[PDB]
């Protein structure tokens, strides 16, 4: 007879949703915010079993968007922090190079006790410093929506300079290659994209859609972007992403009604992470038996 | 408030740390890493392949059966332990 045997500490985990601790280097951020000291540890181990991954439904990003907004509200009334899980909790990352938001069958997945560095930027129509600047170009696609966000390669660097914005910053060779991969992106329905594409701006009406919003040491910038498509403080920018809502009504022509939501920018930074609660309980059958 | 944020995480860790140790330590084993129990394993045909098998995959294979095996522990512990009290009375 094989009797039930209980095992403690075996590897097993499930989904989770809890807040995370602080981890940051720089001090003097709202009276230290009661934040723990940061440990220099970016180690990652190799795991074989696949694990489901998501970028829109994961709860890790949902707390960042609320936390970052709360910090900005205190100003009304630039930091680099990190989240480290407590004991019994871990973070997973998909090291697959073909990640596009949905990787239910990740070939190689790593387990890390802490996430990476992230940047907070309240900006619209552009992707500021970011952290996923890499040599690979890929675009996230929602299954429950078309909503997309495009990552930009670091080779172009898309130099931007703003004063008082004057910039060429076209990189005509850069845009030609990337859009051809949006056709080669895992799904692209109709709209063959044969040398015809226009970045149609949102229709007139509400002021917010008409003009962008960018912050440079606390400046509500509202300028015109019509030219390209068709003492005094100074700042730069290194573009790394761009929000967009892809929509089409006919196969002959397509209109890109780009969105202007700020929450999606932070989701890209932590889009390859999920929080899992480790259950150290395990039950196995063994021939052993307890005395009396 | 960030103060409530930090406090919420800490209390959750202890709240979890004892809940599993509360579900455990009532079956009979307090902190022993591995220990045996008198409950027979149901459906011996479901013996796992010890060579090619992982803990993560097999645990979700028996998720439906977890709720049934755990209940039988309560009866086993109290019933067997209780009878020992009366046995020693005569001696």
């Amino acid at each position: 007879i094989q009797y039930v045997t209980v095992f403690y500490g075996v590897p097993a985990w499930k989904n989770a949703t809890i807040p995370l601790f602080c981890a940051t280097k720089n001090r003097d951020t709202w009276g230290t915010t009661q934040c723990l000291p940061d440990n220099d540890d970016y180690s990652e181990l190799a795991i074989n079993i696949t694990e489901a991954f998501d970028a829109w439904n994961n709860t890790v990003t949902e707390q960042a968007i609320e936390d970052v907004w709360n910090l900005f509200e205190t100003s009304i009334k630039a930091i680099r922090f990190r989240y480290c899980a407590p004991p019994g909790y871990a973070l997973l990352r998909c090291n697959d190079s073909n990640y596009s938001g949905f990787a239910p069958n990740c070939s190689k997945v790593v387990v890390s006790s802490c996430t990476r560095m992230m940047e907070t930027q309240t900006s619209t129509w552009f992707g500021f410093n970011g952290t996923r600047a890499e040599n690979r170009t890929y675009i996230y696609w929602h299954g429950k929506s078309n909503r997309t966000i495009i990552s930009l390669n670091k080779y172009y660097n898309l130099t931007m300079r703003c004063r008082r914005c004057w910039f060429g910053g076209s990189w005509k060779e850069a845009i030609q290659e990337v859009k051809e991969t949006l056709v080669k992106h895992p799904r692209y329905t109709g709209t063959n994209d044969t040398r015809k594409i226009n970045l149609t701006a949102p229709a007139g009406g509400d002021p917010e859609v008409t003009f962008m919003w960018t912050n440079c040491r606390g400046e509500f910038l509202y300028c015109k972007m019509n030219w390209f498509l068709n003492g005094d403080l100074t700042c730069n920018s290194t573009v790394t992403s761009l929000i967009a809502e892809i929509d089409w009504t006919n196969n002959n022509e397509t209109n890109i009604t780009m969105s202007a939501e700020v929450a999606e920018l932070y989701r890209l930074e932590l889009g390859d992470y999920k929080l899992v609660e480790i259950t150290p309980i395990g039950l196995a059958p063994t021939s052993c038996r307890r005395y009396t | 408030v960030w103060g409530t944020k930090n406090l919420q995480t800490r209390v959750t860790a202890i709240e979890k740390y004892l809940k599993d140790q509360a579900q455990l330590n009532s079956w009979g084993c307090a902190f022993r890493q591995v220990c045996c129990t008198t409950v027979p394993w149901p459906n011996e045909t479901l013996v796992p392949n010890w060579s090619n098998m992982t803990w993560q995959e097999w645990e979700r294979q028996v998720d439906f059966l977890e709720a049934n095996i755990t209940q039988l522990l309560e009866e086993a512990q109290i019933q067997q332990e209780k009878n020992m009290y009366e046995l020693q009375k005569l001696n």
Partner: antibody
Amino acid sequence: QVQLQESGPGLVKPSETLSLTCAVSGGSVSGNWWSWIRQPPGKGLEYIGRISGSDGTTYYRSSLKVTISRDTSKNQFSLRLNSVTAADTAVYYCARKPTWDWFDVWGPGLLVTVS
Amino acid sequence: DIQMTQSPSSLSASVGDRVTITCRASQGIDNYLNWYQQKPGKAPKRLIFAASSLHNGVPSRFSGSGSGTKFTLTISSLQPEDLGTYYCLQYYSDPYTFGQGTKVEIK
């Protein structure tokens, strides 16, 4: 969960083939250990053989020289024996072999009779 | 081969009394025992298996125990439902040995 049913002739003369069928519904014959037991009207239970649906094990009693097939077909199995003896007549029951698992079911069975 | 000695097949008992049924083991079978109860003209149903492992259907009245050489079955109370024939089964070795059955008749 399961609704075991069976049927049989119920009238077998001595020295003819013995055929009895027990139907399996809601479960797979393979992967389950099955056995056949008969209840004599006066005597108690007696073990007469064992068979495994996995096909990896085959254990019979070396006193009755009897074999039982495990043809799946449509999830059914039956008993095969020839030259029935007078002492071998009894009420035949179909059920899985007793094991150390929570699940075990038995069929009502039917009586076999000889002249 | 081994021989099993069962309790007497004849039993007269009154309500509220304790009934003990035993079938002795010839050697250390290591609690591979099982029990069954067959009604007249009906199939048996498991009550207790593996010496001490409760099966759904009766809260506490049926409870066996014993290991090694000594084995016993203790019933706290007798009820109208408990009736028929009782058997104990062992499967440690290939040649099985069975009991004589108890033609229990209450009064």
